[PDB]
Amino acid sequence: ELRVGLEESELWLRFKELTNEMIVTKNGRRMFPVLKVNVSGLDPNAMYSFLLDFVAADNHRWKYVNGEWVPGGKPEPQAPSCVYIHPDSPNFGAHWMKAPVSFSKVKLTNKLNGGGQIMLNSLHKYEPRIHIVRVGGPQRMITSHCFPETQFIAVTAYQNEEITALKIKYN
Numbered sequence: 001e002l003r004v005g006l007e008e009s010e011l012w013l014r015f016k017e018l019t020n021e022m023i024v025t026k027n028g029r030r031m032f033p034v035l036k037v038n039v040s041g042l043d044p045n046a047m048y049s050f051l052l053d054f055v056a057a058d059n060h061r062w063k064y065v066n067g068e069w070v071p072g073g074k075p076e077p078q079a080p081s082c083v084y085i086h087p088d089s090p091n092f093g094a095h096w097m098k099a100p101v102s103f104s105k106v107k108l109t110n111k112l113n114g115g116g117q118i119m120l121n122s123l124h125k126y127e128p129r130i131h132i133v134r135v136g137g138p139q140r141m142i143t144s145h146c147f148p149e150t151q152f153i154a155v156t157a158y159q160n161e162e163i164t165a166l167k168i169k170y171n
């Protein structure tokens with residue numbers, strides 16, 4: 001059975017219990033913590049690409065109001081985000097299972113750009129999701145996994161200094 005797990009879940013849970021925030025810039029900003037996934041149960045010899053996208057967790061705008069995050073009252077349907085291809089893709093099952101698959105080079109932006117950078121809406125809450133795509137073979141296959149532990153609000157600057165402090169303490 002194909003098993004997908006989150007590396008460093010206990011750290012992600014520290015961020016999550018404060019409401020995690022990720023900075024977005026015009027040119028795009030890398031994530032901290034980095035999404036790292038433990039994968040087992042692949043065919044060592046089969047061919048796979050690792051894809052990353054961000055699901056709008058709800059249809060609302062969020063605002064930091066008197067030291068706490070609160071959703072607006074005006075739901076807007078959230079278009080799905082663009083997909084980031086892990087740069088080691090495409091690659092053998094063995095490659096993907098020998099060390100945690102680390103998305104250290106994805107950059108989160110607030111502006112439509114050449115591409116590579118993933119555009120998110122500022123003050124929307126996001127749930128990271130991967131797709132493991134079996135490629136090359138006749139029969140294609142996808143397996144998808146969400147990481148609730150890694151939810152965050154996209155922000156142009158940090159609102160909760162408790163987050164600012166955790167980011168510095170562990171980077």
Ligand SMILES: CCn1cc(NC(=O)C2CCC2)cn1
Binds near residue numbers: 049086087089090135
């Ligand atoms: C990072 C190098 N790279 C990989 C691709 N495309 C794929 O792997 C396709 C299989 C479905 C997505 C394009 N560039």
